[PDB]
Amino acid sequence: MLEQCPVTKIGPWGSSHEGTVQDITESPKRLESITLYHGWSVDSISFTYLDHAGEKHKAGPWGGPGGDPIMIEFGSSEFLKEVSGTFGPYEGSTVITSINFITNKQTYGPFGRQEGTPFSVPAQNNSSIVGFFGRSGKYINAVGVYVQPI
Amino acid sequence: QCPVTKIGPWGSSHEGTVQDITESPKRLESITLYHGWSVDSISFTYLDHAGEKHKAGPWGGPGGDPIMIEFGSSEFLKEVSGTFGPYEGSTVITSINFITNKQTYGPFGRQEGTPFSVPAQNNSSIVGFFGRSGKYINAVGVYVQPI
Numbered sequence: 001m002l003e004q005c006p007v008t009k010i011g012p013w014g015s016s017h018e019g020t021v022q023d024i025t026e027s028p029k030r031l032e033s034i035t036l037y038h039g040w041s042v043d044s045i046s047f048t049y050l051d052h053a054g055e056k057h058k059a060g061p062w063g064g065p066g067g068d069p070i071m072i073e074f075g076s077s078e079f080l081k082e083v084s085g086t087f088g089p090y091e092g093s094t095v096i097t098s099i100n101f102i103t104n105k106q107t108y109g110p111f112g113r114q115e116g117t118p119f120s121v122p123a124q125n126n127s128s129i130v131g132f133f134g135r136s137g138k139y140i141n142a143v144g145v146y147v148q149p150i
Numbered sequence: 151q152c153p154v155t156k157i158g159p160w161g162s163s164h165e166g167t168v169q170d171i172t173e174s175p176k177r178l179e180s181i182t183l184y185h186g187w188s189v190d191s192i193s194f195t196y197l198d199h200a201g202e203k204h205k206a207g208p209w210g211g212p213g214g215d216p217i218m219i220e221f222g223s224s225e226f227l228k229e230v231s232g233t234f235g236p237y238e239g240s241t242v243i244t245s246i247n248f249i250t251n252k253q254t255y256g257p258f259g260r261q262e263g264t265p266f267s268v269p270a271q272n273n274s275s276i277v278g279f280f281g282r283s284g285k286y287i288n289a290v291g292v293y294v295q296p297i
Binding site for chain 1: 152153155156157158159160264265266267268269270271272274280291294295296297
């Protein structure tokens, strides 16, 4: 139905310009899973999506090698409604310090440490977050979203 | 057809009453706002997907210096950003800023508090607003239309 609609790219949030640019080269239509490595920090993000041609891809990891993973598997009627968190300085760079994933079914997080400036990306009504882009190094410097009608 | 993406709002989750538009927005024609201690009020005119034009607002209250923005025929709004914070017991939108594909308007208001931003990429366009308001503008979000 709405899976054919074009996606909207919005963001990123966090560091204005630090880190290696990370993005995807197909248009995401469905978010299948996220793997986030975390502890006291938000270490890396990965995610699997279906594109608008129905092909599956895994992006990431974007970030460094620390932390322990959580894998969030989207249920068949589960969609991502909001990403939120905090960002702030660490060792001379601005990093995402905490992150939180709010679906229509559950909240996963917060992961990392709730310190610095808050950010939030809420998709309303007929909108869901289907993929990410951003900048990273040892941690995640900035993150943005792709948003699709559902 | 395809619903327009709706993102936000940022600011108070509970103050004011909900403000929103009733049609699917396709093109943003103009914005009027007033600014002083905060973004006191906002209105905007948009074209919907049936070709009707609508003026939304004013959302907010009296006071402040007026600003009127009329978009060029091939000008579109790429980013809205601002701040929210406390004013006389309320959480309000303290400042707002607009970046089009041709120029920047703002910032308007007092850049105090928590920042927010909607940088619309890939030639998408911010085509309308929603939020919460009463005496002040307590929260704001946007509608984004992809190319």
